[PDB]
Design a protein around this ligand. Structure first.
Ligand code: NAG
Ligand code: NAG
Ligand code: NAG
Ligand code: NAG
Ligand code: NAG
Ligand code: NAG
Ligand code: NAG
Ligand code: NAG
Ligand code: NAG
Ligand code: NAG
Ligand code: NAG
Ligand code: NAG
Lengths: 369, 414, 204, 99, 49
């Protein structure tokens, strides 16, 4: 606000205006990102009091109704782990309490209602049946889930417990979000620090220059400081444009992960983290989002002899839904991604031509029901 | 807003137009306590002053010099300054000053100006033409003139060459006024170079004695140690002001603070050089500096084709300092608050939005996040759809900018 | 007679309070782990600036002299604590060439169990004296425990200094160099640790 | 004097080219997205939930537009429903059945 | 290597600092891209004979 500089700044025309348009562009992108990730749902679903979820203990990832602002327990860990000339630090369009409602609603739909709450009106479904469908998604016959439902729930709750300990015991999992705040605090501190720099001028104290000098000399010295301070701002805003384009690339990825990895069961290998995908839950965090991906990973295995077909009445038979396997003494058909042996039958197979074409075919009895 | 957007028509939305900043309500000035005055009682109320050939000299340094009492001292028959105004002196600073002082007949005060000729200037204390400083004198007939004559006051009448600027010359050696060999004894053609005014009470007002001081100012390679006395104001608190502490100029809401400085420390800096606190130089409280309230001004509006009512946000500014309503986004003005919390027509910040509604006005509210739904979930039961609809959905993507090209030499140099 | 500085000789570089920050600056400092001269004497050069310290529980070490000659030909500093306080003068002196007891002039001013220390530099023409007094229990060598020196006086006297000597229980002298440094402030605005950026790759 | 005008103009033109580069990087990303939307939502049927419009995607029709493309996504949305009693399996005589 | 030049370059402050820093930012990201593409698999499956 020192008047001699305020006069001389009018020499440069549009620069000291258009930086506010540039930074307004940055500002709108933040609420655009935040909206396009979290607002992917038309109604604020909320969960009934019951917990008949087949033993899946979601109490850690659901909102605690007693919590000062309605975070989940795990959202609260994440909130705790992440940590003046001309400056303004604007509000986000949405408050942390609003974000907690969106991360509640999406999760409430994802718990209660399959994928349907993304694709249309939310339709309630029993949670075991939702996991049974998601198992069918990765190619496992739905009975295999129900026949292990307690063991799977016990594995899942154990895994959720291990998530709490992983997040609590080290901050190093949250490095990305802390890095983003650190980059901004660094940039702003250097932008402020450049006010002390001299740029070939007599001083970096503005009113000092005005006290020492001839008006004409002071105009030269002040034009140096204006030139330095201007180039500093153009440098900083150049960084914030590039950085906002980067964070928006992350935002369009996040927006995709919501639509594909929460609202559905997007099959894309190694999109929903490691392993064949089952479902994923969003949790809010400062400036960001945290996905709990839930994924099936096979873990004990056996060798079998295999033949790409079997021969019976001189007709070749192929497995209808799986692969043929043996331990040398007999032959069984099994589903591709989990050991589940069955008797070879006309309906567990299909016919295609005479045997003589097929390399590695084996002779065996098809039982015909 | 029209003037900001370079248009006579404006569409529905919000636009930042300008900067709001509380003005510096007044100025606060602070300096070290009233201290270290130069010894001028011993320069103007002192009992005697020298015979001018051997004029008194004293170094003045390490002290503030009040010249205002001197230009206010109406008893000065003469008070003059050269190279500078007497009113400016209480702002100036110098390495040294000297109290070059004596007695003469008042008539010879005509010689006590820059570059002048005559016995006192040429043979006792030479004023240069370039003299940047002041002359002071006052009648002293009641002290320096005596019945039958005071002969003790002497001046050099005779010299073979002129003194150099502000040179001194005690030398009593006999003035050889011709070819006659004087060999340092008095006689014909062999005069005492010093001569007596012999001040008698019968003398006319100019022939009478005057006490004299010439203030020789001196700035050199060594830093200033003589300065005009600075002036502190009262210190207002908790209101935005311009300020100075010693050399620390600034502007802000000065407040008291809890801060425990070390006794030698004068002011604080924050995380990144900015001055955040100060010691007062007259009663050693530590004051915080807190920023003078400022933020963007933005105008919230329906489409100008639809209404010309408008509302204003002062971005982050509390309403206290600016219909009126407070928000986490700052003070909102002209809009009307309402509890009924619809979806966002225009976004403000911190969950707050505004719209034009029913006699229609700009309402402002905490936004809806959409309608709530307690889903009737229970592991006994499912819902399955009996009927369906095709939907058609527009989605739009840009694919090309306008292919733009510039001859940089034509753009730069025409 | 060489000995070593280790961690000694850091002082508040300006009159500024800094709130618990790891601030940094470039100034004249005693380089960390540099050599120093040791004493129980000659006239000494001043170089860029002087660090002095002693185990002086008795104040029998009592004064210092500074200047170009530091004698007669130009205005020259004499400093002596008269046991009432520190006394300073700047004359073109003709005083005693070696003051001890058996067992133009222009300005003046007046202000093992223990250790007492000072740092002397002139910048622009203003002359600084930084100072410390501390308890100790050390026998010989400089104490490697960290501490800071603090300003006494800031004098407009403008003198060219190139030599000095001390007047008069173990004592030590070292020379400053222009160094970039790190300084650890605490929640009370005292300096509490420091790093010589030129010392070693970890320091860098 | 003219060296000041050259300096100013040149600094302005560098700023302008920097704006167009960063803007063009967005439009390249938008083009990659659109090209993918063409390949998946038109030359096929993406199974990816809410990639092609909202709800289960049937197909989409591109329509040309100034500086861009407009998709018309065609989607199936279930619209009326009933509650039911359900079970994960049915036991017949001793043996469990699954659908 | 001119000291006369270097002193002036220091009066312009943290530009020279942040330009080395930003290019280091570019450089590290090249190794990161390479691990993100190729280092997806933790076991080095050798070829069968
Ligand atoms: C399977 O067979 C191979 C070859 O005989 C052997 O190396 C391996 O240990 C066996 N078991 C498993 C689980 O791979
Ligand atoms: C596996 O071995 C057991 C024991 O010989 C036999 O009962 C079973 O039918 C074998 N299965 C196959 C497919 O070889
Ligand atoms: C399998 O490998 C053996 C190696 O001796 C070879 O003789 C045989 O023809 C191969 N069988 C098939 C089905 O390729
Ligand atoms: C399968 O049975 C036929 C019967 O004619 C025989 O010729 C053939 O060698 C058998 N092949 C194998 C691989 O057992
Ligand atoms: C000198 O005397 C006058 C009265 O003659 C008095 O007002 C003044 O305060 C005295 N002191 C000084 C320093 O002028
Ligand atoms: C300043 O002088 C006034 C009046 O003599 C006195 O009340 C105050 O205590 C003094 N303060 C200091 C710091 O000398
Ligand atoms: C608004 O400003 C007044 C005056 O500073 C203050 O009393 C009040 O507590 C402020 N309220 C908020 C929420 O800042
Ligand atoms: C959950 O399912 C069990 C078994 O079908 C049933 O006993 C219980 O009443 C169900 N509870 C709810 C709220 O659906
Ligand atoms: C399905 O909805 C459409 C809406 O136009 C209606 O015409 C149709 O009769 C409905 N069919 C059934 C079986 O509900
Ligand atoms: C430093 O002092 C040691 C003994 O303390 C001595 O040997 C050495 O020569 C001195 N000089 C250097 C450069 O180390
Ligand atoms: C810091 O200041 C407080 C309050 O005066 C004091 O109690 C504490 O001892 C000080 N601590 C240090 C480390 O100087
Ligand atoms: C399903 O049944 C429950 C309990 O009667 C009821 O609250 C809910 O509105 C019903 N939903 C539909 C779509 O009929």
């Amino acid at each position: 606000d020192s008047t001699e500089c305020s006069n001389l700044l009018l020499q440069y025309g549009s620069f000291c205006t258009q930086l506010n348009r540039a930074l307004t562009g940055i500002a709108v992108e933040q609420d655009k990102n935040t909206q396009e990730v979290f607002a992917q749902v038309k109604q604020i679903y909320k969960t009934p009091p019951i917990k008949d979820f087949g033993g899946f203990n979601f109490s850690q990832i659901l909102p605690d109704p007693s919590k000062p602002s309605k975070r989940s327990f795990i959202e609260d860990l994440l909130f705790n782990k992440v940590t003046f000339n001309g400056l303004t630090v604007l509000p986000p369009l949405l408050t942390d309490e609003m974000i907690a409602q969106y991360t509640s609603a999406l999760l409430a739909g994802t718990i209660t209602s399959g994928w349907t709450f993304g694709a249309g009106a939310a339709l309630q479904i029993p949670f075991a049946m939702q996991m049974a469908y998601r198992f069918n998604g990765i190619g496992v016959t739905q009975n295999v889930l129900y026949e292990n439902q307690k063991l799977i729930a016990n594995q899942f709750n154990s895994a959720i417990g291990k998530i709490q300990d992983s997040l609590s015991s080290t901050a190093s999992a949250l490095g990305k979000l802390q890095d983003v705040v650190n980059q901004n605090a660094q940039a702003l501190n250097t932008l402020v620090k450049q006010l002390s720099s001299n740029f070939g001028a007599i001083s970096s104290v503005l009113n000092d220059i005005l006290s020492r000098l001839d008006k004409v000399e002071a105009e030269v010295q002040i034009d140096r400081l204006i030139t330095g301070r201007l180039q500093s701002l153009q440098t900083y805003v150049t960084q914030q444009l590039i950085r906002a384009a980067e964070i928006r690339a992350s935002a369009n990825l996040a927006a995709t992960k919501m639509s594909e990895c929460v609202l559905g069961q997007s099959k894309r290998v190694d999109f929903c983290g490691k392993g064949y995908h089952l479902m994923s839950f969003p949790q809010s965090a400062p400036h960001g989002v945290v996905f709990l991906h839930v994924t099936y990973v096979p873990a004990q295995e056996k060798n079998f002899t295999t033949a790409p077909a079997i021969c019976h009445d001189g007709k070749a038979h192929f497995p209808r839904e799986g692969v043929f396997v043996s331990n040398g003494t007999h032959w069984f058909v099994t589903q591709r991604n989990f050991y589940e042996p069955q008797i070879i039958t006309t309906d567990n197979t299909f016919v295609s031509g005479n045997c003589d074409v097929v390399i590695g075919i084996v002779n065996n009895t098809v039982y015909d029901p | 807003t029209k003037c900001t957007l370079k248009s006579f028509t404006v569409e529905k939305g919000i636009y930042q137009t300008s900067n709001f900043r509380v003005q510096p309500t007044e100025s606060i000035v602070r300096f070290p306590n009233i201290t270290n005055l130069c010894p001028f009682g011993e320069v103007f109320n002192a009992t005697r002053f020298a015979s001018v050939y051997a004029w008194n000299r004293k170094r003045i340094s390490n002290c503030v010099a009040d010249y205002s009492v001197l230009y206010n001292s109406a008893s000065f028959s003469t008070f003059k300054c050269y190279g500078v105004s007497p009113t400016k002196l209480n702002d100036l600073c110098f390495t040294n000053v000297y109290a070059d002082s004596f007695v003469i007949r008042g008539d010879e005060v005509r010689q006590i100006a820059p570059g002048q000729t005559g016995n006192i200037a040429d043979y006792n204390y030479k004023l240069p033409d370039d003299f940047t400083g002041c002359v002071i004198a006052w009648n002293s007939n009641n002290l320096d003139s005596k019945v039958g004559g005071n002969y003790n006051y002497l001046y050099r009448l005779f010299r073979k060459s002129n003194l150099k600027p502000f040179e001194r010359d005690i030398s009593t050696e006999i003035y050889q006024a011709g070819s006659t060999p004087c060999n340092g004894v008095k006689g014909f053609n062999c005069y005492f170079p010093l001569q007596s005014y012999g001040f008698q009470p019968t003398y006319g007002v100019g022939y009478q004695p005057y006490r004299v001081v010439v203030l020789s100012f001196e700035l050199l390679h060594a830093p200033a140690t003589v300065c005009g006395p600075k002036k502190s104001t009262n210190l207002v608190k908790n209101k935005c002001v311009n300020f100075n502490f010693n050399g620390l100029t600034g502007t802000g809401v000065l407040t008291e603070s809890n801060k425990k400085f070390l006794p030698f420390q004068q002011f604080g800096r924050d995380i990144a050089d900015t001055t955040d606190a100060v010691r007062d130089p007259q009663t050693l409280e530590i004051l915080d500096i807190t920023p003078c309230s400022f933020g963007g001004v933005s105008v919230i509006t329906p489409g100008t084709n639809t209404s010309n009512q408008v509302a204003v946000l002062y971005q982050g500014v509390n309403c206290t300092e600016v219909n009126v309503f407070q928000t986490r986004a700052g003070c909102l003005i002209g809009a009307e608050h309402v509890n009924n919390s619809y979806e966002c027509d225009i976004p403000i910040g911190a969950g707050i939005c505004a719209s034009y509604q029913t006699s229609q006005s700009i309402i402002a509210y905490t936004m809806s996040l959409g309608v709530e739904n307690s889903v009737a979930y229970s592991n006994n039961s499912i819902a399955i759809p009996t009927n369906f609809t095709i939907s058609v959905t527009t989605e739009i993507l840009p694919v090309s900018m306008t292919k733009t090209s510039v001859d940089c030499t034509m753009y730069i140099c025409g | 007679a060489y000995t070593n500085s280790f961690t000694r000789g850091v002082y508040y570089p300006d009159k500024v309070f800094r709130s618990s920050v790891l601030h940094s600056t470039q100034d004249l400092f005693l380089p960390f782990f540099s050599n120093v001269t040791w004493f129980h004497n000659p006239v000494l050069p001043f170089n860029d600036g002087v660090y002095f310290a002693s185990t002086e529980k008795s104040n029998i070490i009592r004064g210092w002299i500074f200047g170009t000659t530091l004698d007669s030909k130009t205005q020259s500093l004499l400093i002596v604590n008269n046991a009432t306080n520190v006394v300073i003068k700047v004359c073109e002196f003709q005083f005693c060439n070696d003051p001890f007891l058996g067992v133009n002039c222009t300005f003046e001013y007046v202000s093992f169990k223990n250790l007492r220390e000072f740092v002397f530099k002139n910048i622009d023409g203003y002359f600084k004296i930084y100072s410390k007094h501390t308890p100790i229990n050390l026998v010989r060598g400089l104490p490697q425990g960290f501490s800071a020196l603090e300003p006494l006086v800031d004098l407009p006297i403008g003198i060219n200094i190139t030599r000095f000597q001390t007047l008069l229980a173990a004592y030590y002298v070292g020379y400053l160099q222009p160094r970039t440094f790190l300084l650890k402030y605490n929640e009370n605005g005292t300096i509490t640790d420091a790093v010589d950026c030129a010392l070693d790759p970890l320091s860098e």
